[PDB]
């Protein structure tokens, strides 16, 4: 039996590029990525699953935006940021990234959900 | 947002005593227990959440059955065993315990699900 991780996605994220990470593992790796995420970024599942999402950053990504995300994760709060991200072919897009924490019944942090929206 | 852990329970477990444990945490603690489990065993949620399920064992529980469960968990396979368990008031009941592993998309073990059925 494989856990249905998508059973935790909001209504808005259903047809979206979305990823879940596991902050209890070293380096906060992705444990689920939606097909829309893979289509947008140009990766196969094996290329991104189990990796920290920093692979989306590239040479002109703003380092303060990266640190803002890092601090937002440590705060365990809902936050959104516009950040320059890159596909496998090196093309760049402005990503409106929305992150939210997901807790277990005891109240301990369990996952992060991150939804990607290219800014048009 | 609290994860809907019950979104991973089978059809049979829905009205059942069921618990989920997190084997990635030290001592494989419970992270979800159903109300039917709490009613059967006589505990409040705060008394059992975050604890290893060994609190259900008592003075006449068979130590080989306990070790069989331990080995079955290490095998990461589906298994069922009849084991003597105890409620908070010290009364005993034969528990038909069914355990199954739950994996993440990458194929790594994620949770154990355990369903309890008193043998009548
Ligand atoms: C669930 C989740 C989704 C994320 N999605 C993105 C993303 O789409 N683009 C991005 O640049 N960073 C994303 N991140 C952030 C990176 O994984 C990483 O946390 C960020 O680069 C800051 O951490 P670092 O200083 O270790 O790089 C996401 C993080 C999480 C937890
Ligand atoms: C999900 C789950 C449910 C369990 N339910 C029971 C149970 O109902 N009764 C019981 O005696 N042991 C149950 N166990 C087993 C104990 O938690 C523990 O694994 C067992 O006692 C063997 O491990 P130990 O040698 O550390 O005690 C359950 C284990 C898991 C992972």
Question: What does it look like?
Answer:
Chains A, B: This is Putative blue-light photoreceptor. Chains A, B: InterPro entries: PAS, PAS-assoc_C, PAS-like_dom_sf. Chains A, B: Keywords: Chromophore, Flavoprotein, FMN, Nucleotide-binding, Receptor. Chains A, B: GO terms for molecular function: nucleotide binding. The first copy, chain A, has one domain (about 1-120): PAS domain (Beta-Lactamase). Helices cover about 20% and strands about 30% of the residues of chain A. Chain A contains 3 helices and 5 strands. Chain A has helices at about 35-40, 45-50, 65-75, and strands at about 15-20, 30-35, 80-85, 90-105, 110-120. A 5-stranded antiparallel sheet of chain A has the order 2-1-5-4-3. The longest helix of chain A has 13 residues, at about 65-75. At the A-B interface, strand 4 of A face strand 4 of B. The structure holds flavin mononucleotide (2 copies). One flavin mononucleotide (FMN) binds near residues 83 and 97 of chain B. One flavin mononucleotide binds near residues 97 and 112 of chain A.
């Amino acid at each position: 039996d494989i856990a249905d991780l998508r059973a935790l996605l909001d209504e808005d994220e259903a047809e979206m590029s979305v990823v879940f990470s596991d902050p209890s593992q070293p380096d906060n790796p992705t444990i689920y990525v939606s097909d829309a995420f893979l289509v947008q970024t140009g990766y196969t599942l094996e290329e991104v699953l189990g990796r920290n999402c920093r692979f989306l950053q590239g040479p002109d990504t703003n380092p303060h935006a990266v640190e803002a995300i890092r601090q937002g994760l440590k705060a365990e709060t809902r936050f959104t940021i516009d950040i320059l991200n890159y596909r496998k072919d090196g093309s760049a897009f402005v990503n409106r990234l929305r992150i939210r924490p997901i807790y277990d019944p005891e109240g301990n942090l369990m996952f992060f959900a991150g939804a990607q929206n290219p800014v048009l």
